[PDB]
């Protein structure tokens, strides 16, 4: 399985409790039970940070909901202790998800006394965990399919939220990993993989080849635009560009292949041959260029078996003219996929620890 997922951002442990504890007892004089119970809920919050961003990595829904709860909580804490004018000192330290950093001294780290920056990197990890769970699904299983489609759309929409938001939410120029350009490209990639899940669902359910071709054609568009975003950049890991380039051509070929079954059904045998020749050319390009990244052997065979039978019978029986590609109609496009908006709360059965305030 050749799906792209994103590694989690690392962060050093922080004592969330103390800098809040003291900032509570300033505007809460009664140091006996009621108003100093926010100081115990602030203890649960520090515990939540360590649970969300501290634990050994769990590629499971349990870890994701923790991460999402913590995002939700941070959004609820921003008005309580007005963070626009700085009066609290709390410094979060996050390492860049992709930048190795020169081994000639230090990785790429950014420390910022900012709720804006923390919730950005948190949301990044929600997106990146969602992407990893999506990619580990069993796509030869209908619930596996449903999980992937759901997690890719979540993540896509979460990267997009950061894109729109990072600059405003931070004081400094962000790290590259969360900059709008990197995170806009990740968004598109997750959206591409979500579309491809719909094509795999449609294929599995043996739906109408016309529909299946339209969903593959739209996947090809999303994969095309993503690689063209990586073409002059070296931010993402080195497998990403060639996997996207190949999926672009793998998807155009699936589009042509399913369109050619529609054509055969309609007895347009010349057009079948023309579409199948297109698909074989595309797939031969991926086999020769992207052999390290994708295994395209059985599709090549399916296509070749079909092209050979098609030519034989056209030559012997039908004698249709094989059209030029530029004379064929365009395959349509069907998108079944969107970037899930981030509207807190995004966690299940969310309770604001500081809802009294």
């Amino acid at each position: 399985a050749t799906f792209i997922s994103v590694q989690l951002k690392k962060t050093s442990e922080v004592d969330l409790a103390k800098p809040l504890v003291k900032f509570i007892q300033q505007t809460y004089p009664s140091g006996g039970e009621e108003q100093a119970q926010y100081c115990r809920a602030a203890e649960e919050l520090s515990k939540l940070r360590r649970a969300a961003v501290g634990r050994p990595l769990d590629k499971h829904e349990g870890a994701l909901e923790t991460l999402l709860r913590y995002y939700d909580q941070i959004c609820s804490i921003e008005p309580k202790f007005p963070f626009s004018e700085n009066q609290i000192c709390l410094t979060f330290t996050w390492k860049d998800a992709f930048d190795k950093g020169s081994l000639f001294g230090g990785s790429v780290k950014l420390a910022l006394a900012s709720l804006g920056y923390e919730k950005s990197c948190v949301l990044f990890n929600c997106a990146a965990l969602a992407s990893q769970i999506a990619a580990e699904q069993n796509l030869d299983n209908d619930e596996g399919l449903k999980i992937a489609a759901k997690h890719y759309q979540f993540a896509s929409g979460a990267f997009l939220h950061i894109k729109e938001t990072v600059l405003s939410a931070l004081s400094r120029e962000p790290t590259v990993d969360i900059s709008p350009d990197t995170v806009g490209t990740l968004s598109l990639i997750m959206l591409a993989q979500a579309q491809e899940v719909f094509f795999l669902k449609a294929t599995r359910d043996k739906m109408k080849d016309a529909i299946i071709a339209k969903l593959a054609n739209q996947a090809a568009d999303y994969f095309g635009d993503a690689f063209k975003q990586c073409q002059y950049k070296d931010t993402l890991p080195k497998e990403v560009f060639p996997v996207l380039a190949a999926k672009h051509c793998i998807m155009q070929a699936n589009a042509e292949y399913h369109q050619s079954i529609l054509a055969k059904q309609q007895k347009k045998f010349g057009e079948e041959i023309a579409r199948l020749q297109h698909a074989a050319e595309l797939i031969k390009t991926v086999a020769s260029r992207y052999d390290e990244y994708v295994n395209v052997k059985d599709f090549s065979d399916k296509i070749n078996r079909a092209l050979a039978a098609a030519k034989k019978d056209n030559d012997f029986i039908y004698h249709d003219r094989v059209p030029d590609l530029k004379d064929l109609d365009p395959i349509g496009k069907a998108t079944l996929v969107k970037s899930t908006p981030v509207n807190v709360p995004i966690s299940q059965k969310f309770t604001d620890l500081f809802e009294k305030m």
């Binding site: 449903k146 759901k150 719909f198 449609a202 739906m207 109408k208 529909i211 069907a334 079944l336």
Partner: peptide
Amino acid sequence: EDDDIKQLAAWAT
């Protein structure tokens, strides 16, 4: 066609 997209889309919910 139009209604087979509809059911794919609603499966995703």
